[PDB]
Amino acid sequence: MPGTKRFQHVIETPEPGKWELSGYEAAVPITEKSNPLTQDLDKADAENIVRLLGQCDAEIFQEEGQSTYQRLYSESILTTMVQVAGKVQEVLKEPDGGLVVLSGGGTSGRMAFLMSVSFNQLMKGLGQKPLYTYLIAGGDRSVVASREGTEDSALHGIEELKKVAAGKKRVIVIGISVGLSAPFVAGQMDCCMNNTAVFLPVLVGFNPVSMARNDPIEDWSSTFRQVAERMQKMQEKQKAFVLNPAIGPEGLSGSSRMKGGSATKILLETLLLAAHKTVDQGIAASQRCLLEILRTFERAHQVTYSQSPKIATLMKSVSTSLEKKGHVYLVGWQTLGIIAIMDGVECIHTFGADFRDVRGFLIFTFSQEDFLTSILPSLTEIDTVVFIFTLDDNLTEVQTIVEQVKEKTNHIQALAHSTVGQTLPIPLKKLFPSIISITWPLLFFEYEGNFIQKFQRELSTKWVLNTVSTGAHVLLGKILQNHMLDLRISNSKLFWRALAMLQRFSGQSKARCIESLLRAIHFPQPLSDDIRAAPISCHVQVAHEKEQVIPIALLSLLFRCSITEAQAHLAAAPSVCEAVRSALA
Ligand SMILES: CC#C[C@H]1CN(S(=O)(=O)c2ccc(N)nc2)CCN1c1ccc([C@](O)(CO)C(F)(F)F)cc1
Ligand SMILES: O=P(O)(O)OC[C@@H](O)[C@@H](O)[C@H](O)[C@@H](O)CO
């Protein structure tokens, strides 16, 4: 039948009560699962939200129970991290013709970028040629933009990989896809396995390979699952690797920018730092060297979330400023500035939020006076401005901007990272009455930019901003249980996630859910056979431009009404969320 090719793989909606027993729940990839910790996130207050996401984040470091999926601290995974460290060493020994590519779409792409900078710094600080580079779905502009549509082409990913791998002789490609999902990465990994004399593929993600994405890619014959399965078979001969610990579901279902992006740093910084810091000691990388770093990253979670009450309070002030109709500014220096930008941009697709809503700023890259002349004018009594810096930064360039922002604002708070026994100049740095001082132990660093201190701080800021940005929006009522219902379908994965959210919330068949979705997308056109049979990219291109696609589709289903009837209903309701929630009642 028309459409059967495209929707065949979709699992049927189970009867009420048999979601487990149908085996439906066991085929939801971990990365898409509803986190049971966060069943009631939409009812939690700011302090609970901070507690619940701190807990969700902590699952990255939880160990394997006694029939179950490997985790970060399991022997299989640490052994894989060691062997990969190994192969990275081979390349560092022979820098002529060597390269190390870190590649990903969206937030994996963003994380790849940071890491490639950091490790390129490390080799410069030592007077070696930089061997690292990144690749991101949609070219370099994607690092700092919302561009969710660019991950769906495998030919594109292969193309970018051909550019950068030039006339190199030995290339390590670290394909990062949290969901073992992105067609961008799938093609790179497959290309690598076709030329193993040159390429070494290393796939990173957080699902077991049996849960790796398995629906057809438009411009490629194999699926992510097949690719990953074959890489795993190559791992026995040490010519591909899959690094895939389970880290438990996201506190917001499928929001892999959060735990996923965190775990990607933890995992890859750990393993590359080990490889570097042990080549020059003329010593193989070992589980013990990795563990030191992992445990440090795990302290960093504890350290970070010990500031929870203040994290909640910043959340309440980001949420207030948006409940009214103001903006939120994230102002930071070096790498922490970048991360601020990344958090703000992600809010666009993640929450349906305007680029002004939560904007990041590096001292997007506007200098000291430039910020004071350009941006400072537009600030307002109800806004919120967040300063994010270390004490090693240049605190004259900092205090100035706060002195000034104070006049027009008052809702300021800050995020200051410090070694123990550094002191915050101006005892009236109040200015910031009740800062978020994150104060780090003295650790034993030996490379000269103190890279482990950088990684701690990056990660800790990520956790704070993510929890803040995400929390603020949940308080505003935009999240249904722990799902973002009203998302914008801008790629195939998101189209599938809409469909799943329809099955779950309505309890109705896959055929009806698909019909309602496609009707909602293509309204005012009716469902023809061509539309039914169209590749998923055609539905994405049309949905991408609309508003409220998913809630209109769910209302059509709940009320068993037309798209004309459900648009009328929505428009007659005080708000999308009330329309949906009361229709669910
Ligand atoms: C239809 C469908 C579906 C699945 C899979 N799709 S997907 O893009 O095909 C995909 C993505 C990643 C992966 N590893 N495998 C497949 C991503 C969305 N997804 C999904 C399934 C169920 C659910 C929920 O049922 C929604 O209620 C759950 F509760 F589990 F969150 C959420 C997402
Ligand atoms: O790394 P994945 O699973 O391939 O996902 C890649 C991107 O889709 C993902 O990072 C997305 O942009 C974020 O909005 C997720 O919160």
Side-chain angles (χ1 to χ4, degrees), residues 9-11 19 24-25 27-29 31-34 179-181 207 211-215 225 253 482-483 492-501 503-505:
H9 71 276
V10 171
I11 302 306
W19 283 87
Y24 178 100
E25 232 77 270
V28 180
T31 55
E32 298 286 331
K33 275 186 220 294
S34 169
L180 301 189
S181 162
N207 280 312
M211 274 164 172
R213 194 162 172 190
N214 207 49
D215 58 293
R225 195 129 129 187
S253 314
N482 48 202
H483 295 298
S492 64
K493 176 174 65 173
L494 285 169
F495 171 103
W496 299 122
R497 187 177 301 151
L499 179 53
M501 281 188 292
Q503 293 169 260
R504 173 82 68 185
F505 284 126

mmCIF file of all heavy atoms in Angstrom, residues 9-11 19 24-25 27-29 31-34 179-181 207 211-215 225 253 482-483 492-501 503-505, ligand 1:
data_model
loop_
_atom_site.group_PDB
_atom_site.id
_atom_site.type_symbol
_atom_site.label_atom_id
_atom_site.label_comp_id
_atom_site.label_asym_id
_atom_site.label_seq_id
_atom_site.Cartn_x
_atom_site.Cartn_y
_atom_site.Cartn_z
ATOM 1 N N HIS A 9 8.553 0.073 9.388
ATOM 2 C CA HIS A 9 9.351 -0.186 10.571
ATOM 3 C C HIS A 9 8.736 0.323 11.897
ATOM 4 O O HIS A 9 9.137 -0.107 12.979
ATOM 5 C CB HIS A 9 10.698 0.461 10.358
ATOM 6 C CG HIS A 9 10.665 1.956 10.401
ATOM 7 N ND1 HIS A 9 10.336 2.736 9.309
ATOM 8 C CD2 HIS A 9 10.918 2.816 11.416
ATOM 9 C CE1 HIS A 9 10.385 4.011 9.652
ATOM 10 N NE2 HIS A 9 10.743 4.087 10.926
ATOM 11 N N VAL A 10 7.776 1.248 11.815
ATOM 12 C CA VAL A 10 7.275 1.922 12.979
ATOM 13 C C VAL A 10 6.572 0.860 13.796
ATOM 14 O O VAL A 10 5.781 0.152 13.256
ATOM 15 C CB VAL A 10 6.339 3.074 12.572
ATOM 16 C CG1 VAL A 10 5.626 3.655 13.767
ATOM 17 C CG2 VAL A 10 7.150 4.176 11.938
ATOM 18 N N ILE A 11 6.879 0.726 15.083
ATOM 19 C CA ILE A 11 6.192 -0.252 15.897
ATOM 20 C C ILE A 11 4.750 0.189 16.195
ATOM 21 O O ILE A 11 4.507 1.371 16.500
ATOM 22 C CB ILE A 11 6.926 -0.490 17.236
ATOM 23 C CG1 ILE A 11 8.377 -0.968 17.009
ATOM 24 C CG2 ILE A 11 6.195 -1.547 18.055
ATOM 25 C CD1 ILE A 11 8.550 -2.186 16.111
ATOM 26 N N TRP A 19 2.163 -1.775 27.229
ATOM 27 C CA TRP A 19 3.314 -1.090 26.663
ATOM 28 C C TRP A 19 4.617 -1.864 26.922
ATOM 29 O O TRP A 19 5.437 -2.006 26.018
ATOM 30 C CB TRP A 19 3.377 0.338 27.170
ATOM 31 C CG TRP A 19 2.386 1.267 26.494
ATOM 32 C CD1 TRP A 19 1.089 1.496 26.858
ATOM 33 C CD2 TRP A 19 2.633 2.115 25.352
ATOM 34 N NE1 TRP A 19 0.505 2.411 25.997
ATOM 35 C CE2 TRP A 19 1.434 2.811 25.076
ATOM 36 C CE3 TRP A 19 3.750 2.350 24.536
ATOM 37 C CZ2 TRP A 19 1.325 3.718 24.025
ATOM 38 C CZ3 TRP A 19 3.632 3.238 23.491
ATOM 39 C CH2 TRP A 19 2.439 3.921 23.246
ATOM 40 N N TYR A 24 7.177 -3.127 23.562
ATOM 41 C CA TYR A 24 7.286 -1.862 22.848
ATOM 42 C C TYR A 24 8.390 -1.082 23.546
ATOM 43 O O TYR A 24 9.329 -0.621 22.896
ATOM 44 C CB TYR A 24 5.986 -1.059 22.861
ATOM 45 C CG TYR A 24 6.090 0.271 22.161
ATOM 46 C CD1 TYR A 24 5.621 0.443 20.885
ATOM 47 C CD2 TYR A 24 6.693 1.359 22.777
ATOM 48 C CE1 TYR A 24 5.742 1.673 20.250
ATOM 49 C CE2 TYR A 24 6.827 2.581 22.144
ATOM 50 C CZ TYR A 24 6.346 2.742 20.889
ATOM 51 O OH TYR A 24 6.467 3.969 20.270
ATOM 52 N N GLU A 25 8.263 -0.971 24.871
ATOM 53 C CA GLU A 25 9.202 -0.211 25.703
ATOM 54 C C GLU A 25 10.634 -0.688 25.538
ATOM 55 O O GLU A 25 11.556 0.109 25.521
ATOM 56 C CB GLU A 25 8.783 -0.271 27.173
ATOM 57 C CG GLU A 25 8.667 1.094 27.835
ATOM 58 C CD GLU A 25 7.405 1.866 27.471
ATOM 59 O OE1 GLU A 25 7.458 2.616 26.490
ATOM 60 O OE2 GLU A 25 6.386 1.782 28.168
ATOM 61 N N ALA A 27 12.028 -1.776 22.848
ATOM 62 C CA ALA A 27 12.603 -1.308 21.609
ATOM 63 C C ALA A 27 12.733 0.249 21.516
ATOM 64 O O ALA A 27 13.195 0.764 20.486
ATOM 65 C CB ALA A 27 11.799 -1.858 20.419
ATOM 66 N N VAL A 28 12.335 0.996 22.539
ATOM 67 C CA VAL A 28 12.608 2.440 22.507
ATOM 68 C C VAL A 28 14.064 2.616 22.834
ATOM 69 O O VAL A 28 14.494 2.238 23.929
ATOM 70 C CB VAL A 28 11.751 3.281 23.482
ATOM 71 C CG1 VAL A 28 12.113 4.769 23.370
ATOM 72 C CG2 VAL A 28 10.254 3.065 23.186
ATOM 73 N N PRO A 29 14.849 3.180 21.893
ATOM 74 C CA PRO A 29 16.260 3.440 22.244
ATOM 75 C C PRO A 29 16.407 4.178 23.548
ATOM 76 O O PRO A 29 15.527 4.985 23.929
ATOM 77 C CB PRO A 29 16.765 4.282 21.079
ATOM 78 C CG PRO A 29 15.816 4.007 19.950
ATOM 79 C CD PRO A 29 14.496 3.772 20.589
ATOM 80 N N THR A 31 18.114 6.519 24.293
ATOM 81 C CA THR A 31 18.304 7.955 24.097
ATOM 82 C C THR A 31 16.976 8.680 23.916
ATOM 83 O O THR A 31 16.893 9.910 24.102
ATOM 84 C CB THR A 31 19.230 8.278 22.905
ATOM 85 O OG1 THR A 31 18.753 7.662 21.669
ATOM 86 C CG2 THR A 31 20.647 7.776 23.205
ATOM 87 N N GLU A 32 15.942 7.933 23.548
ATOM 88 C CA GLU A 32 14.628 8.504 23.341
ATOM 89 C C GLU A 32 13.710 8.269 24.479
ATOM 90 O O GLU A 32 12.642 8.819 24.476
ATOM 91 C CB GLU A 32 13.999 7.931 22.077
ATOM 92 C CG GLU A 32 14.820 8.276 20.836
ATOM 93 C CD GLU A 32 14.688 9.721 20.401
ATOM 94 O OE1 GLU A 32 13.633 10.310 20.640
ATOM 95 O OE2 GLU A 32 15.639 10.266 19.795
ATOM 96 N N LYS A 33 14.128 7.488 25.469
ATOM 97 C CA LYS A 33 13.237 7.075 26.535
ATOM 98 C C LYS A 33 12.832 8.232 27.411
ATOM 99 O O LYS A 33 13.519 9.232 27.486
ATOM 100 C CB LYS A 33 13.837 5.943 27.415
ATOM 101 C CG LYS A 33 13.641 4.502 26.904
ATOM 102 C CD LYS A 33 14.150 3.483 27.928
ATOM 103 C CE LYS A 33 14.889 2.291 27.331
ATOM 104 N NZ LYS A 33 14.017 1.405 26.494
ATOM 105 N N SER A 34 11.666 8.054 28.026
ATOM 106 C CA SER A 34 11.148 8.883 29.082
ATOM 107 C C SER A 34 11.874 8.543 30.355
ATOM 108 O O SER A 34 11.755 7.425 30.823
ATOM 109 C CB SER A 34 9.655 8.543 29.317
ATOM 110 O OG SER A 34 9.173 9.148 30.501
ATOM 111 N N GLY A 179 22.603 9.159 19.567
ATOM 112 C CA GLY A 179 21.546 8.213 19.394
ATOM 113 C C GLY A 179 21.964 7.085 18.487
ATOM 114 O O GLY A 179 21.160 6.232 18.211
ATOM 115 N N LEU A 180 23.218 7.067 18.048
ATOM 116 C CA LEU A 180 23.650 6.215 16.935
ATOM 117 C C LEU A 180 22.556 6.360 15.848
ATOM 118 O O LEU A 180 21.955 5.387 15.420
ATOM 119 C CB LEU A 180 23.835 4.791 17.378
ATOM 120 C CG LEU A 180 24.834 4.511 18.500
ATOM 121 C CD1 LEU A 180 25.028 3.005 18.639
ATOM 122 C CD2 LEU A 180 26.170 5.162 18.190
ATOM 123 N N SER A 181 22.319 7.617 15.472
ATOM 124 C CA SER A 181 21.234 8.053 14.653
ATOM 125 C C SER A 181 21.620 8.796 13.368
ATOM 126 O O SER A 181 20.953 8.617 12.358
ATOM 127 C CB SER A 181 20.355 8.994 15.470
ATOM 128 O OG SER A 181 19.505 9.782 14.626
ATOM 129 N N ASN A 207 23.734 4.431 22.888
ATOM 130 C CA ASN A 207 22.771 3.361 22.806
ATOM 131 C C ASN A 207 23.512 2.072 22.535
ATOM 132 O O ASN A 207 24.563 2.054 21.882
ATOM 133 C CB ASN A 207 21.769 3.594 21.664
ATOM 134 C CG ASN A 207 20.666 4.575 22.011
ATOM 135 O OD1 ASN A 207 20.034 4.481 23.064
ATOM 136 N ND2 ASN A 207 20.358 5.474 21.071
ATOM 137 N N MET A 211 20.027 -1.113 19.427
ATOM 138 C CA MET A 211 19.057 -0.032 19.441
ATOM 139 C C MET A 211 19.483 1.076 18.515
ATOM 140 O O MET A 211 18.934 2.178 18.576
ATOM 141 C CB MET A 211 18.987 0.564 20.839
ATOM 142 C CG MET A 211 18.035 -0.125 21.786
ATOM 143 S SD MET A 211 18.411 0.387 23.486
ATOM 144 C CE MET A 211 17.000 -0.374 24.310
ATOM 145 N N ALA A 212 20.516 0.839 17.711
ATOM 146 C CA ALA A 212 20.999 1.851 16.788
ATOM 147 C C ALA A 212 19.930 2.081 15.753
ATOM 148 O O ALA A 212 19.239 1.163 15.391
ATOM 149 C CB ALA A 212 22.261 1.395 16.122
ATOM 150 N N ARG A 213 19.807 3.305 15.278
ATOM 151 C CA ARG A 213 18.794 3.663 14.268
ATOM 152 C C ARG A 213 18.807 2.741 13.040
ATOM 153 O O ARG A 213 19.891 2.399 12.509
ATOM 154 C CB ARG A 213 18.997 5.116 13.873
ATOM 155 C CG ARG A 213 17.861 5.698 13.115
ATOM 156 C CD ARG A 213 17.903 7.213 13.139
ATOM 157 N NE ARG A 213 16.897 7.702 12.226
ATOM 158 C CZ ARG A 213 16.746 8.964 11.816
ATOM 159 N NH1 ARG A 213 17.525 9.947 12.255
ATOM 160 N NH2 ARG A 213 15.794 9.243 10.948
ATOM 161 N N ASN A 214 17.604 2.313 12.632
ATOM 162 C CA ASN A 214 17.409 1.295 11.570
ATOM 163 C C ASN A 214 16.403 1.608 10.463
ATOM 164 O O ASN A 214 16.175 0.764 9.662
ATOM 165 C CB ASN A 214 17.103 -0.111 12.152
ATOM 166 C CG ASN A 214 17.548 -1.264 11.215
ATOM 167 O OD1 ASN A 214 18.672 -1.301 10.718
ATOM 168 N ND2 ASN A 214 16.654 -2.194 10.972
ATOM 169 N N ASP A 215 15.857 2.806 10.385
ATOM 170 C CA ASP A 215 15.059 3.233 9.217
ATOM 171 C C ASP A 215 15.961 3.736 8.065
ATOM 172 O O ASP A 215 17.019 4.258 8.323
ATOM 173 C CB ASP A 215 14.035 4.330 9.570
ATOM 174 C CG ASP A 215 14.688 5.575 10.174
ATOM 175 O OD1 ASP A 215 15.227 5.476 11.296
ATOM 176 O OD2 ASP A 215 14.631 6.664 9.590
ATOM 177 N N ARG A 225 22.400 1.121 12.102
ATOM 178 C CA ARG A 225 22.549 -0.175 12.768
ATOM 179 C C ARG A 225 23.475 -1.111 12.026
ATOM 180 O O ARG A 225 24.281 -1.759 12.666
ATOM 181 C CB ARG A 225 21.236 -0.851 12.881
ATOM 182 C CG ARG A 225 21.151 -2.040 13.862
ATOM 183 C CD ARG A 225 19.946 -1.626 14.631
ATOM 184 N NE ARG A 225 18.953 -2.583 14.764
ATOM 185 C CZ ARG A 225 17.752 -2.335 15.303
ATOM 186 N NH1 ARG A 225 17.363 -1.130 15.715
ATOM 187 N NH2 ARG A 225 16.919 -3.346 15.400
ATOM 188 N N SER A 253 13.014 14.038 27.448
ATOM 189 C CA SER A 253 13.114 12.912 26.553
ATOM 190 C C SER A 253 13.667 13.336 25.223
ATOM 191 O O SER A 253 13.139 14.226 24.596
ATOM 192 C CB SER A 253 11.764 12.267 26.335
ATOM 193 O OG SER A 253 11.085 12.096 27.557
ATOM 194 N N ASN A 482 7.530 14.912 30.614
ATOM 195 C CA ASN A 482 8.955 15.131 30.232
ATOM 196 C C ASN A 482 9.195 15.021 28.745
ATOM 197 O O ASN A 482 10.244 14.563 28.290
ATOM 198 C CB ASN A 482 9.933 14.231 30.978
ATOM 199 C CG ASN A 482 9.528 12.776 30.980
ATOM 200 O OD1 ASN A 482 9.985 12.044 31.855
ATOM 201 N ND2 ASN A 482 8.679 12.340 30.032
ATOM 202 N N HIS A 483 8.211 15.493 28.003
ATOM 203 C CA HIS A 483 8.268 15.540 26.570
ATOM 204 C C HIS A 483 8.088 16.980 26.099
ATOM 205 O O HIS A 483 7.281 17.754 26.662
ATOM 206 C CB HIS A 483 7.138 14.678 26.021
ATOM 207 C CG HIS A 483 7.278 13.226 26.340
ATOM 208 N ND1 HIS A 483 8.345 12.469 25.903
ATOM 209 C CD2 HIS A 483 6.477 12.381 27.027
ATOM 210 C CE1 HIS A 483 8.197 11.224 26.314
ATOM 211 N NE2 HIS A 483 7.066 11.141 26.987
ATOM 212 N N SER A 492 14.377 14.216 10.058
ATOM 213 C CA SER A 492 13.667 12.945 10.056
ATOM 214 C C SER A 492 13.496 12.394 11.487
ATOM 215 O O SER A 492 12.410 11.956 11.888
ATOM 216 C CB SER A 492 14.438 11.959 9.199
ATOM 217 O OG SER A 492 15.719 11.685 9.750
ATOM 218 N N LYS A 493 14.550 12.462 12.283
ATOM 219 C CA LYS A 493 14.458 11.990 13.663
ATOM 220 C C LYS A 493 13.359 12.679 14.468
ATOM 221 O O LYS A 493 12.605 12.068 15.203
ATOM 222 C CB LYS A 493 15.807 12.159 14.357
ATOM 223 C CG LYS A 493 15.789 11.785 15.830
ATOM 224 C CD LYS A 493 17.215 11.849 16.380
ATOM 225 C CE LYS A 493 17.790 13.266 16.371
ATOM 226 N NZ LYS A 493 19.079 13.229 17.075
ATOM 227 N N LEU A 494 13.233 13.967 14.266
ATOM 228 C CA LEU A 494 12.232 14.744 14.909
ATOM 229 C C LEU A 494 10.866 14.336 14.345
ATOM 230 O O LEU A 494 9.879 14.278 15.065
ATOM 231 C CB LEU A 494 12.538 16.209 14.649
ATOM 232 C CG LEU A 494 13.699 16.829 15.430
ATOM 233 C CD1 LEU A 494 14.068 18.194 14.892
ATOM 234 C CD2 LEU A 494 13.258 17.021 16.888
ATOM 235 N N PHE A 495 10.799 13.997 13.059
ATOM 236 C CA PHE A 495 9.508 13.586 12.508
ATOM 237 C C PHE A 495 9.131 12.289 13.210
ATOM 238 O O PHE A 495 7.994 12.130 13.697
ATOM 239 C CB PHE A 495 9.598 13.450 10.986
ATOM 240 C CG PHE A 495 8.398 12.824 10.348
ATOM 241 C CD1 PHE A 495 7.456 13.604 9.689
ATOM 242 C CD2 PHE A 495 8.229 11.452 10.364
ATOM 243 C CE1 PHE A 495 6.354 13.040 9.078
ATOM 244 C CE2 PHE A 495 7.132 10.886 9.760
ATOM 245 C CZ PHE A 495 6.190 11.676 9.122
ATOM 246 N N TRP A 496 10.080 11.372 13.357
ATOM 247 C CA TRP A 496 9.744 10.127 14.091
ATOM 248 C C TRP A 496 9.346 10.348 15.544
ATOM 249 O O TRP A 496 8.419 9.706 16.036
ATOM 250 C CB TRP A 496 10.858 9.117 13.980
ATOM 251 C CG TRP A 496 11.111 8.724 12.563
ATOM 252 C CD1 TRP A 496 12.270 8.847 11.901
ATOM 253 C CD2 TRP A 496 10.166 8.149 11.639
ATOM 254 N NE1 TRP A 496 12.148 8.349 10.623
ATOM 255 C CE2 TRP A 496 10.860 7.924 10.428
ATOM 256 C CE3 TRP A 496 8.816 7.770 11.733
ATOM 257 C CZ2 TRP A 496 10.257 7.372 9.297
ATOM 258 C CZ3 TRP A 496 8.181 7.188 10.585
ATOM 259 C CH2 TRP A 496 8.914 7.015 9.383
ATOM 260 N N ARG A 497 10.018 11.271 16.217
ATOM 261 C CA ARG A 497 9.705 11.591 17.608
ATOM 262 C C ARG A 497 8.300 12.216 17.751
ATOM 263 O O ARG A 497 7.571 11.920 18.713
ATOM 264 C CB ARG A 497 10.771 12.514 18.198
ATOM 265 C CG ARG A 497 10.629 12.769 19.712
ATOM 266 C CD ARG A 497 11.769 13.634 20.234
ATOM 267 N NE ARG A 497 13.089 13.023 20.005
ATOM 268 C CZ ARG A 497 14.244 13.675 19.830
ATOM 269 N NH1 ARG A 497 14.274 14.997 19.842
ATOM 270 N NH2 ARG A 497 15.387 13.001 19.636
ATOM 271 N N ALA A 498 7.910 13.068 16.809
ATOM 272 C CA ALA A 498 6.514 13.538 16.783
ATOM 273 C C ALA A 498 5.571 12.367 16.716
ATOM 274 O O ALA A 498 4.658 12.250 17.553
ATOM 275 C CB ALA A 498 6.260 14.461 15.610
ATOM 276 N N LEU A 499 5.782 11.491 15.735
ATOM 277 C CA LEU A 499 4.886 10.333 15.562
ATOM 278 C C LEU A 499 4.752 9.498 16.851
ATOM 279 O O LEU A 499 3.651 9.165 17.286
ATOM 280 C CB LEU A 499 5.354 9.463 14.407
ATOM 281 C CG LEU A 499 4.565 8.197 14.101
ATOM 282 C CD1 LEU A 499 3.092 8.559 13.938
ATOM 283 C CD2 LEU A 499 5.111 7.506 12.858
ATOM 284 N N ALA A 500 5.879 9.194 17.477
ATOM 285 C CA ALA A 500 5.868 8.468 18.728
ATOM 286 C C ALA A 500 5.117 9.189 19.829
ATOM 287 O O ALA A 500 4.433 8.558 20.650
ATOM 288 C CB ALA A 500 7.289 8.210 19.200
ATOM 289 N N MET A 501 5.286 10.500 19.905
ATOM 290 C CA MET A 501 4.592 11.253 20.936
ATOM 291 C C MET A 501 3.107 11.219 20.657
ATOM 292 O O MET A 501 2.320 11.038 21.582
ATOM 293 C CB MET A 501 5.113 12.645 21.033
ATOM 294 C CG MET A 501 6.414 12.713 21.789
ATOM 295 S SD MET A 501 6.800 14.439 22.042
ATOM 296 C CE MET A 501 7.151 15.032 20.400
ATOM 297 N N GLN A 503 1.465 8.595 19.152
ATOM 298 C CA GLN A 503 0.981 7.255 19.599
ATOM 299 C C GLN A 503 0.768 7.167 21.121
ATOM 300 O O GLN A 503 -0.251 6.669 21.591
ATOM 301 C CB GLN A 503 1.957 6.151 19.187
ATOM 302 C CG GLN A 503 2.020 5.968 17.688
ATOM 303 C CD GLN A 503 3.153 5.073 17.215
ATOM 304 O OE1 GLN A 503 4.185 5.562 16.765
ATOM 305 N NE2 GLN A 503 2.942 3.757 17.268
ATOM 306 N N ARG A 504 1.742 7.657 21.880
ATOM 307 C CA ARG A 504 1.755 7.566 23.323
ATOM 308 C C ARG A 504 0.621 8.385 23.961
ATOM 309 O O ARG A 504 -0.104 7.890 24.812
ATOM 310 C CB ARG A 504 3.123 8.078 23.818
ATOM 311 C CG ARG A 504 3.319 8.246 25.333
ATOM 312 C CD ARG A 504 3.671 6.983 26.056
ATOM 313 N NE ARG A 504 5.001 6.483 25.706
ATOM 314 C CZ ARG A 504 5.508 5.333 26.148
ATOM 315 N NH1 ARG A 504 4.817 4.569 26.968
ATOM 316 N NH2 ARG A 504 6.716 4.954 25.777
ATOM 317 N N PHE A 505 0.506 9.643 23.572
ATOM 318 C CA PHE A 505 -0.456 10.538 24.170
ATOM 319 C C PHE A 505 -1.873 10.195 23.754
ATOM 320 O O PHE A 505 -2.785 10.318 24.566
ATOM 321 C CB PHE A 505 -0.132 12.007 23.829
ATOM 322 C CG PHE A 505 1.025 12.583 24.623
ATOM 323 C CD1 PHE A 505 2.115 13.167 23.988
ATOM 324 C CD2 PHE A 505 1.022 12.563 26.006
ATOM 325 C CE1 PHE A 505 3.171 13.706 24.729
ATOM 326 C CE2 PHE A 505 2.077 13.092 26.742
ATOM 327 C CZ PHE A 505 3.157 13.665 26.104
HETATM 328 C C1 LIG B 1 8.239 6.213 15.625
HETATM 329 C C2 LIG B 1 9.419 6.178 16.507
HETATM 330 C C3 LIG B 1 10.433 6.175 17.155
HETATM 331 C C4 LIG B 1 11.650 6.173 18.018
HETATM 332 C C5 LIG B 1 12.858 6.166 17.024
HETATM 333 N N1 LIG B 1 12.941 7.429 16.278
HETATM 334 S S1 LIG B 1 14.108 7.302 15.209
HETATM 335 O O1 LIG B 1 14.400 8.606 14.606
HETATM 336 O O2 LIG B 1 13.667 6.259 14.267
HETATM 337 C C6 LIG B 1 15.532 6.655 15.984
HETATM 338 C C7 LIG B 1 16.422 7.482 16.666
HETATM 339 C C8 LIG B 1 17.487 6.925 17.351
HETATM 340 C C9 LIG B 1 17.638 5.552 17.298
HETATM 341 N N2 LIG B 1 18.667 4.992 17.914
HETATM 342 N N3 LIG B 1 16.754 4.762 16.609
HETATM 343 C C10 LIG B 1 15.728 5.272 15.975
HETATM 344 C C11 LIG B 1 13.226 8.463 17.261
HETATM 345 C C12 LIG B 1 11.965 8.652 18.134
HETATM 346 N N4 LIG B 1 11.557 7.399 18.785
HETATM 347 C C13 LIG B 1 10.767 7.475 19.926
HETATM 348 C C14 LIG B 1 9.989 6.426 20.297
HETATM 349 C C15 LIG B 1 9.179 6.505 21.421
HETATM 350 C C16 LIG B 1 9.143 7.625 22.220
HETATM 351 C C17 LIG B 1 8.205 7.669 23.396
HETATM 352 O O3 LIG B 1 7.279 6.593 23.314
HETATM 353 C C18 LIG B 1 7.326 8.893 23.271
HETATM 354 O O4 LIG B 1 6.300 8.700 24.271
HETATM 355 C C19 LIG B 1 8.932 7.594 24.729
HETATM 356 F F1 LIG B 1 8.109 7.492 25.768
HETATM 357 F F2 LIG B 1 9.583 6.444 24.731
HETATM 358 F F3 LIG B 1 9.646 8.735 24.847
HETATM 359 C C20 LIG B 1 9.929 8.695 21.877
HETATM 360 C C21 LIG B 1 10.723 8.614 20.732
#
